[PDB]
Amino acid sequence: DMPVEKILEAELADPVTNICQAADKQLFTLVEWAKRIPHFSELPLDDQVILLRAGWNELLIASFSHESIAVKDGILLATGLHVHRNSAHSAGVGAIFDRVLTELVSKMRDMQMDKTELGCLRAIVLFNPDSKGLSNPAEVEALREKVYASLEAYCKHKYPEQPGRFAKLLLRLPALRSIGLKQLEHLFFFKLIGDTPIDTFLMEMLEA
């Protein structure tokens, strides 16, 4: 069973240096979030590790993006600060930052994506059965299927006048996939050049 109520409960529990500081802080919150997603903590520990190492940056991007709906031309960080796109551009990361604004924040704003929908999309990303090394991909696939069954039922009840809303939510996941890949590429470069402080948890996520 996979009740949206529990997924919501889990949710409601230089500029680049600021952003990396906020990401490290939020990685601790992400672990606490995943443990509250039904059945995640019952997976083998090694598989919990695999799923979070595979999805962490997409999970973080989805969350701050949704928190940024009320920010004009910028994002809200976990530390409470805003980053405006002018500042992102002046730090050399303007293109990937604008993709977050255009493909994620502005779309979440325009459809008024709610926190239950965000949480369910977050849980679908978490339960990624393509993650390499999983001891039982089918088990993770089954949990993903339970989430998107629950999400579809929620959308049809809450937004009956929008039959396409469920598909619209899922069709933000390719953009999230692409944005995450490019964000990660930038972060690996920051680590290589060494001029950006990276705290311990964020650093560990950049290990092999």
């Binding site: 601790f28 672990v31 443990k35 520990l45 919990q48 590790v49 979070l52 190492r53 311990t200 948890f201 560990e204 290990e207």
Partner: peptide, 12 residues
């Protein structure tokens, strides 16, 4: 090998 993440997941 993912020290912090293991440390945080295992503890209840």
């Amino acid at each position: 090998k993912h020290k912090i993440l293991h440390r945080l997941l295992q503890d209840s």
